Amino acid sequence: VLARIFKETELRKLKVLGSGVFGTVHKGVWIPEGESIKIPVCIKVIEDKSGRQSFQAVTDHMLAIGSLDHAHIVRLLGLCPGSSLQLVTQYLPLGSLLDHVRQHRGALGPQLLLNWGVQIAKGMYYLEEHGMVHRNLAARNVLLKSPSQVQVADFGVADLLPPDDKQAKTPIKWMALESIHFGKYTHQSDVWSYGVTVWELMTFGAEPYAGLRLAEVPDLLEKGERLAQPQICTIDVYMVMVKCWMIDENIRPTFKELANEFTRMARDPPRYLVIK
Ligand SMILES: COc1cc(Nc2c(C#N)cnc3cc(OCCCN4CCN(C)CC4)c(OC)cc23)c(Cl)cc1Cl
């Protein structure tokens, strides 16, 4: 695939859906010139409020995000350079998997939970096979394309911005220790974030390290503390998560191994998730 470079005139933002550190997200419309059609899209505006740099040039890394497509990632339809960067995707109205599980909780049933572990790993495996480091995997950035199928969103976006060493800006509770301590991001550090994400699913959207201050999270990890075993998880599921949070980057599983292992468990869900 190949992403489109939009003219500013064929994009219109219509409503803010959210706002974080990696930009503001809008419901939008794509109006391709002269075709008499208005296509619903989702628009993420990235503005560098720290250093006030522009995004007028189409970098190799923006083209890399735009040449990826897979059933379990959100395709980047295109972008629109400018003083702020606009990223354009399909609009997925069903929203985020985090909100879904928080609302329905155990009513979702064990098959769907394990199936989603498979799908997120397959999406991540695709991204790894194409050399794309996500840098911000989390249950909030897994989106429902359908009631049963999810897609990994926001891959590559953190790299669109240069680091600011000015003295909360990054998602500490989802990050591998090597990323916190050294700013190093790899497919192996995406595996750590994957383990947190599937922990979010099995707890139905509990907050990781619920009541501790962010400053204290690295020290607890080095001392060997980890997210607790979810109530529905048998020891076999939890052990897959624990291997994801090894400080040794080389002991963590691969995305191929993770998709394989959740495939095997999804073949007999109640032997692995026990939902009262
Ligand atoms: C464009 O670029 C990017 C966009 C995104 N984020 C989203 C992507 C994608 N992709 C796709 N689809 C999304 C749909 C959303 O809202 C749907 C449900 C909300 N409704 C609000 C109003 N009430 C009445 C009903 C529910 C949404 O909300 C925040 C974010 C979405 C990301 Cl994570 C990264 C990049 Cl680079």
Residue numbers in the entry: 680 to 846, 852 to 960
What's the publication's text?
The HER3 KD functions as an obligate allosteric activator and is itself catalytically inactive, despite high-affinity binding of ATP. The role and relevance of ATP binding for the HER3 KD remains to be defined, but emerging evidence suggests a function in structural stabilization. HER3 is not only essential for tumorigenesis but also functions in mediating drug resistance that becomes apparent when HER2 inhibitors are used to suppress HER2-HER3 signaling.
First, we determined whether displacement of ATP from HER3 KD by high-affinity-binding small molecule ATP analogs, all previously characterized as type I inhibitors, could have an effect. However, none of the small molecules suppressed constitutive HER3 signaling driven by HER2 overexpression. Lack of the inhibitory effect of drug binding on HER3 signaling might be a consequence of the ability of these ATP-mimetic drugs to preserve the same conformation of the HER3 pseudokinase domain as ATP binding. To obtain deeper insights into the effects of drug binding to the HER3 KD, we determined the crystal structure of the HER3 KD/bosutinib complex to a resolution of 2.5 Å. In this structure, HER3 KD adopts the so-called Src/CDK-like inactive conformation, which is the same conformation that HER3 adopts when bound to the ATP analog AMP-PNP (root-mean-square deviation [RMSD] = 0.39 Å). The identical conformational states in the AMP-PNP and bosutinib-bound structures are achieved despite significantly different binding modes employed by bosutinib and the nucleotide. The AP-2 pocket is largely conserved between EGFR and HER3, and it encompasses four hydrophobic residues in HER3: F704, L709, W728, and V786. The pocket adopts a partially open conformation in both the ATP- and bosutinib-bound HER3 structures, stabilized by an edge-to-face π-stacking interaction between F704 and W728. Most importantly, it is connected to K742 in the nucleotide-binding pocket via a network of hydrogen bonds within the β3/β4 strand that extends to V786 in the AP-2 pocket. The side chain of the preceding residue, I741, makes direct hydrophobic interactions with the side chains of L709 and V786.
